[model samples]
Target: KIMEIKLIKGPKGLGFSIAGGVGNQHIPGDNSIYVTKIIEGGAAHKDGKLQIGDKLLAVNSVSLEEVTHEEAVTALKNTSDFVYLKVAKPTS
Candidate 1:
């Protein structure tokens, strides 16, 4: 099973973002992170080697089930680097 990112709101419209959970009604329901298309020369596409049909497994040390969309945003607020993802990609 793979974990994806999500968007959970905050207080009085002042909400945060987070790595969404799989099967949380926030993601595509496939338990995966859906990148519509791979960007040319992009980080996931180039450096990270992520593809379009890959599922992002983890953000930070927290698992997708352990964190919420809002929590992920809070964690990323002070971060500015490559976020780790335990993912699975299509082999085709």
Candidate 2:
């Protein structure tokens, strides 16, 4: 099953940041996007649904698995205040 999170866009951005900080466990040569930080008291932190180390699988039901970092950022930037996410906790 997939976990869901909703975030509102703050003045700076989404109030959180993610990166290919963790090596993929299931797929070789493919990096996974993980939550690297959550802005203090930001939209994500305020919502309390996201945490550091969580893998971001999708945004607004759109899969990021095959997208590049630039594309992912573009997708997020186009989103409005309301954001939807599918995430998984770190396994290692």
Q: Evaluated with lDDT, which candidate comes out highest?
A: 2
lDDT for each residue of candidate 2 in 24-67, tens digit (9 for 90 to 100): 33245657676779999888899998888787788886677766
> Model 2: runs farther than 4 Å from truth?
21-28
| lDDT of model number 2 | 0.74
Candidate 2's displacement at residue 58, Å, is 1.0
Which candidate has the top score in TM-score? 2
TM-score of 2: 0.79
Q: Provide TM-scores for the models.
A: 0.44, 0.79
Which pairs of residues collide in candidate 1?
Answer: 5-20, 6-20, 10-15, 17-73, 18-69, 18-72, 18-73
